[PDB]
């Protein structure tokens, strides 16, 4: 018996060489590999086959090799490869990826993927699952903004804030001990995981060393607090011995050095340099040349992702408007001019293609969006395909190359710059288990399913009061994970090893699950998955052209993108 | 190039179900008054009573369609059904409580089949 | 009023109906939540003048066509599920490929 | 001085012998008795009578004989009588029905039904009070449901579910002890009773029995899971030992057995079989034959509730479309004309007029709706009264006997099933104060206040910024009993007394107050409150016509129902 | 817009009352919630205009009739309350028996 | 549809300027926040027409002029934000002094 290819891929999801259009760009994806039994698949319904005695086993407790949940028929999309498997969840984490179900009658099960009476399903077949995005430069402004991270396949928080106080609105900074202790408190009610990152500022250790020890889980440098040489000296400092990692916000003023002086101050140290294109930030016009250091691990913000015929407008006015900036003061026009560069954002979008900025991040309410990370990181991907064609390395005809180099600049590397690779960031055996399920006319849209530590957390679902789940209206809601006591076990509060150490999850009662933030200070740009490339990058300082080996990097705007007025009601 | 948001084009080719496994066809009937269906994992043997066909080819099988289909009798029909053998250690749990073991033990499994009037222990 | 939950909700696909219907009368092709507030919309106030599920399962696949919509809402809509309040109590229709 | 009966009515209520129309049904209710003192009645307000030195007694503490909460003037509708009567509560629980006031200076009252200076009142004078709806047969697919079933007066759900999982989707489960005890610590948020079911599934005694010791409250065997003889058995044996309730959905393919194989496997123990009717699962096409048996609590769920024109057209397409049913496949067409059959539900009508089905339920998101179990029985109530009369045993041209059958449905028998009677469903000294007051206009449609603990939960209430409670706009919404840590005393979870005895509670840090399920395993239909009937019941196998007694039963579907376009926006 | 709790809440009656009102249009008898929104947007609107308490307390019995809503309406309702800002700020207007 | 939650929030705007216009239709001098909803809702449904942030900017300054609006409006009214999706992507609309 044969099952012509169309059928199987109806019924149980794609399988080896079958591609998969993501939502409505022109990128596609190839199933790499199959862990499955053709035969023996898994599938959960009325005469399906995970039922005891057949596919599910009957004999078997829970701690015997059998899951708490089997994710059937996932096309798994990764930085580790993109291919199609069961997964396997236990304790809150991946405890195996492979083929679930049944020893006693199936070929192939891995050994602990067992099906048995402590099993739920969730059927993936027809899905891409992806790990959560790792949001690692969001301002804790408004908790509604957890929500919108959420629908966008986000479920890792990492910034800073107190609410919508200047300082917070301008920073993502939680500044000393006491507000990092209320946002600590804070956190236990919002259903996402979260890092706090303390104010990068001082001259003396002891002022910044003692937010670290409070709970913070890292610090940021801001011009806005003063990014001035002895602020990143004793920053990195505190850094080196609290094993956190640093972001970085440089003085777009150059007032007290140039982006030479900046690196100078860095000495070589590992840093995280937000928005590095410069129009959120940073040494004008320059900035960006941090890109091609062995020490950074460079990131941008979302607005400028990709460079379109909208985006100059919108952020001048943006920047007009928010720093109060007359239209008449000609300094204030400079300022603005010496910020908002065409060229360096054009050439932004090739340094995403060429693997040289490795990173993707929202720079939530105070200059991006809490929920477009993933959506424009994809919206890129695309524009780059259609411009620059398929990259050299592809096979097949798919985009599996560019769908890796893209998908870790949101989910595996934020997770390593931060310090919190070994618990999230990808889908791999014995990290914990944040999936993201997309209906792949959706994908990187709206996702259908996010699951934090093993439990749904929040699902685009219709009418409660409805027979059964699908009738209208569908929207985001938030699921039984947020709900009650189990908020607290489906999510992680990242700290640094010191506050875990001197007990402050007791001391402030939190009972959240607690992640120590670790291997931040050894790593450099070459650990970058997929986006390990250092280079010489030069840009002209009269007209602001960017070259990288001598190459001058230029790049139009497009008039349309995909995912968007298709998906949107505004 | 019209675009069919997240459209499938899928590979050339076609799947074989069970590959390698020992295939066998035997006729079967639903002797009682209302329908049976029968999934693509239950132990053969251990099907409804009232389904007539020799039991002992049922034993260490179960059919050979995809998984998760299953096979219709209204009542009183017979047709042909194809079986595949069982994989993984053959050895069967529960359901009817027929085998609860190895599937080889077949005296053990027909015995047991022949007190409780599963039809077609020959 | 004293209205529950449901009541609550569903008056939002009213509305989108609404800025829906006000979208395509300018001119614009609908897109996919455009499109299926309309057709959701439409179902329910059909239960409300007493039409029967068989009725609104006819009707509910010629409320849209496939010019009124932008490229592949089509195919992305498989069908469309609305429960309302009929004449003998609450049913759940289902329009299947609501726009060919 | 007397008062006429029409002012005395609408005044304090009604009473003896007065008749209330039950919402725009045909159906009227009669008081029985009354326990007041005409001229002393309580009631609350400016030169009224509880007030201090009058109607409220001035000298007692709150030890001595008096209440926390008074319900003045209530016409209780209850499977113990329709009777108008004071209710009295303490520490949450019931402990007076009978007449309150002041024994200084009343005659008539109830000697722990006094009125000091510590006892809340509400004004229940023309108003139905009811027991809080038990419902059984819950899916916990998406929270926003629990305020559905509140708005509809339901106070308890047992049920199953982990979120919007495929497993869940389709069962009552939540399998296995760390699922159990996620949902056990989510509950700590839901402001409704919860009783959580595993998975009545395992061909080994241990899997399934450690699911009772992690805090399951219950078992349910699901065809989706292999509603096998094996899993029958071991279920039932589990349930013998624990002291739960099992409930089935039996196999609706006779894949390994037909009804009297089930039966069989059953072996004379006790069982919930659900949706007996089988439009939502069963044997095909005789499962309703279940509800004849001794030893089987037979409940409908509510969709088929009551039979209408429109009925099987929205089942058809429902089941098509939840199994991916294709209509050009002749085994699906076979399928679903198998299972959708206007000869039993035409039946089930007939059966729930007879007492021969006991109990209502929703199966609320996974074919079922969360907020109309109330609804809907009372529906059927009415439209057996249209189409067959009163019943025989009516007096005084009241409705009585069979309001008391009815609401038998889903208040008391559902808790008598699961072991749960001795807190829940029904308005009687000692149980719990789960109360619901009704406007007679918005009988069985919306509920005015839902009491939990003692404390309003929910309620029908208007503007919260206005100067009184009543402006638009009236929409149901929270209480404060539902708020902080009030939620914890004025909701029960519900588990097994070997949970309990090893600390499961503590282990979890839950909060709520903790009920034991209990007395399952010894009772039997006989025990069904007002829906106790043992019969034959055939169902012809060609023709499926159902008879009793040697009865054919008919039925014709109606048109047009109560409770509905007159109440609902959509 | 800085709208505080009451002015999102209050925004739906509007959107009912539109919803009850196109109902109307298209020849049905209203029912119980719908009649309900009707007038208590009539009376928002009202404020809205600079009219009194005293008029909207007599309009208010004359925007539904008996013959605009299903059997039993009229009896259902016994008074309509509502609070909106007049140029005097925000009062209280209740309207009895608003249909015969 | 599956609405995220700022396609929630937004449709209040779209509903709120429906009230407001039905009130200018009226006769009424428009107020703080019915202003504000009316300019917001234009910016939105302008972008969902695929004018570009500079036509919005211009236009967004004579939608509405002082004679349409009480007392002071204007001048409470520095300007006015909001964020739609354009033909390619959410982008954010500021127009300064709305309202002369
Ligand atoms: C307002 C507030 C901010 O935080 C930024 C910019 C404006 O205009
Ligand atoms: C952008 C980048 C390239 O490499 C080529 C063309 C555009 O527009
Ligand atoms: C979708 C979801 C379910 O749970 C059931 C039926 C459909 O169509
Ligand atoms: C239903 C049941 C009866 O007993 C009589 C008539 C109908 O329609
Ligand atoms: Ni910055
Ligand atoms: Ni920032
Ligand atoms: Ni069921
Ligand atoms: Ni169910
Ligand atoms: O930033
Ligand atoms: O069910």
């Given at each position: 018996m044969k099952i012509n290819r169309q059928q199987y891929a109806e019924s149980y999801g794609p399988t080896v060489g079958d591609q998969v259009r993501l939502?409505?760009?022109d990128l596609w994806i190839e199933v790499?590999?199959?862990?499955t039994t053709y035969g023996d698949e898994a599938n959960f319904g009325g005469?399906?086959?995970?039922?005891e005695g057949m596919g599910?086993?009957?004999?078997?407790?829970?701690?015997?090799?059998?899951?708490?949940l089997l994710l059937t028929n996932a096309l798994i999309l990764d930085y580790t490869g993109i291919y199609k498997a069961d997964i396997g969840v236990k304790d809150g984490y991946i405890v195996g990826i492979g083929k679930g179900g049944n020893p006693d009658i199936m070929?192939?099960?891995?050994?602990?993927?067992i099906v048995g009476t402590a099993t739920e399903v969730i059927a993936a077949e027809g899905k891409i699952v992806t790990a959560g995005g790792i949001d690692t430069?969001?301002?804790?402004?408004?908790?509604?903004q957890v929500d919108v991270a959420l629908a966008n396949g986000i479920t890792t928080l990492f910034g800073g804030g107190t609410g919508p106080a200047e300082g917070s609105k301008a920073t993502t900074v939680t500044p000393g001990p006491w507000n990092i202790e209320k946002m600590l408190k804070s956190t236990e009610g919002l259903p996402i995981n979260v890092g706090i990152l303390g104010k990068?500022?001082?001259?003396?250790?002891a002022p910044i060393m003692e937010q670290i020890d409070a709970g913070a889980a890292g610090l940021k440098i801001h011009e806005d607090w003063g990014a001035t040489p002895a602020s990143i000296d004793r920053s990195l400092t505190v850094a080196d011995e609290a094993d956190v990692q640093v972001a970085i916000h440089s003085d777009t003023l150059n007032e007290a050095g140039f982006l030479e002086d900046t690196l100078r101050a860095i000495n070589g140290r590992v840093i995280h340099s937000f928005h590095?294109?410069?129009?959120?930030?940073?040494?004008?016009?320059?900035?960006?040349?941090?890109?091609?250091?062995?020490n950074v691990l460079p990131s941008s913000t979302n607005?400028?992702?990709?460079?379109?015929?909208?985006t100059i407008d919108e952020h001048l006015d943006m920047l007009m408007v928010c720093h109060h900036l007359?239209?008449?003061?000609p300094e204030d026009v400079a300022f603005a001019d010496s910020r908002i560069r065409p060229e360096t954002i054009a050439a932004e979008d090739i340094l995403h293609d060429l693997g040289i900025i490795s990173m993707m991040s929202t720079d939530a309410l105070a200059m991006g969006r809490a929920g477009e990370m993933v959506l424009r990181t994809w919206q890129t991907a695309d524009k780059m395909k259609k411009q620059?064609?398929?990259?050299?390395?592809?096979?097949?005809?798919?985009?599996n190359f560019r769908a890796k180099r893209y998908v870790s600049?949101?989910?595996?590397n934020p997770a390593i710059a931060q310090g919190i690779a070994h618990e999230v960031?990808?889908?791999?055996?014995?990290?914990?288990?944040d999936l993201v399920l997309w209906e792949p006319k959706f994908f990187g849209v709206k996702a259908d399913r996010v699951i934090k530590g093993g439990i749904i957390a929040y699902a685009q679902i219709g009418?409660?009061?409805?027979?059964?789940?699908?009738?209208?209206?569908v929207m985001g809601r938030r699921m039984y994970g947020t709900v009650g006591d189990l908020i607290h076990d489906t999510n992680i509060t990242f700290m640094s090893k010191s506050s875990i150490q001197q007990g402050v999850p007791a001391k402030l009662g939190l009972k959240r699950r607690i992640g120590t933030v670790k291997n931040?200070?050894?790593?450099?740009?070459?650990?970058?998955?997929?986006?390990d490339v250092t280079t010489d990058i030069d840009i002209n300082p009269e007209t602001y052209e960017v070259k990288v080996d001598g190459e001058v990097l230029t790049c139009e705007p497009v008039k349309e993108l995909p995912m968007a007025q298709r998906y949107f009601l505004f | 190039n019209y675009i069919v948001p997240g459209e499938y084009r899928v590979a050339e080719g076609e799947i074989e179900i069970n590959a390698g496994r020992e295939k066998t066809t035997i006729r079967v009937s639903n002797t009682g008054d209302r329908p049976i269906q029968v999934g693509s994992?239950?132990?053969?043997?251990?099907?409804?009573?009232?389904?007539?066909?020799?039991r002992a080819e049922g034993i260490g099988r179960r059919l050979n369609?995809?998984?998760?289909t299953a096979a219709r009798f209204e009542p009183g029909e017979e047709m042909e059904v194809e079986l595949t053998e069982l994989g993984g250690n053959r050895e069967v749990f529960g359901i009817?409580?027929?085998?609860?073991?190895?599937?080889?033990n077949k005296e053990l499994i027909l015995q047991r089949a022949k007190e409780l009037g599963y039809k077609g222990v020959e | 009023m004293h209205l529950n939950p449901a009541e609550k909700e569903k008056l939002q696909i009213f509305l989108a109906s609404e800025l829906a219907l006000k979208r395509k009368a300018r001119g614009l092709k609908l897109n996919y939540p455009e499109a299926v507030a309309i057709i959701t919309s439409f179902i329910m106030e059909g239960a409300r003048d007493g039409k029967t599920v068989a009725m609104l399962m006819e009707e509910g696949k010629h409320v849209?066509?496939?010019?009124?919509?932008?490229?592949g809402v089509p195919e992305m809509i498989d069908d469309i599920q609305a429960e309302a309040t009929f004449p003998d109590g609450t049913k759940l229709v289902t329009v299947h490929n609501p726009i060919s």
């Open positions: 939502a409505d760009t790499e590999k199959d862990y005469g399906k086959v995970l039922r599910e086993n009957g004999t078997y407790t829970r701690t015997e090799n059998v899951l708490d070929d192939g099960v891995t050994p602990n993927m430069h969001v301002h804790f402004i408004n908790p509604d990068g500022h001082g001259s003396s250790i590095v294109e410069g129009a959120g930030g940073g040494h004008a016009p320059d900035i960006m040349a941090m890109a091609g250091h062995p607005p400028t992702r990709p460079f379109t015929v909208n007359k239209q008449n003061i620059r064609g398929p990259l050299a390395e592809e096979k097949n005809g798919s985009d600049k949101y989910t595996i960031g990808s889908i791999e055996e014995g990290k914990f288990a009418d409660p009061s409805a027979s059964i789940p699908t009738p209208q209206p931040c200070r050894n790593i450099g740009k070459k650990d970058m998955k997929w986006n | 994992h239950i132990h053969f043997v251990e099907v409804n009573k009232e389904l007539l066909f020799d369609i995809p998984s998760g009817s409580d027929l085998t609860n073991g190895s599937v080889d | 849209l066509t496939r010019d009124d919509v932008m490229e």
